[PDB]
């Protein structure tokens, strides 16, 4: 039983993950994706001068 | 008769129980046994901090 408990701690350390560290990634590239997606959409416009000039 | 009496007394010596003991282990145990159930009733519950991360 002992040894049960010992083993399966240092299993958790290697497999489980971790939640305050993950939650912390993906609040991260929720806003990355947000910040991506409007520069994308800003790029799109910029042959938009030549009607300008033309 | 004397050698009866004398040989179980020593015979009562070996294979008798302590009730003055044996009760103190048993309340100890009792208590021990409230106390664990407790104790193991309040971990189950730890898993409940990723959901508040969540």
Known sequence: A???AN???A???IV???FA???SQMTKNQVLQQTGSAMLAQANQ???VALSLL
Request: proline share 6%; glycine share 0%; net charge negative.
């Open 2 to 4: 002992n040894t049960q």
């Open 7 to 9: 083993v399966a701690d």
């Open 11 to 13: 299993k958790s350390r």
């Open 16 to 18: 489980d993950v971790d």
């Open 21 to 23: 560290k993950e939650t």
């Open 46 to 48: 910029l042959p938009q």
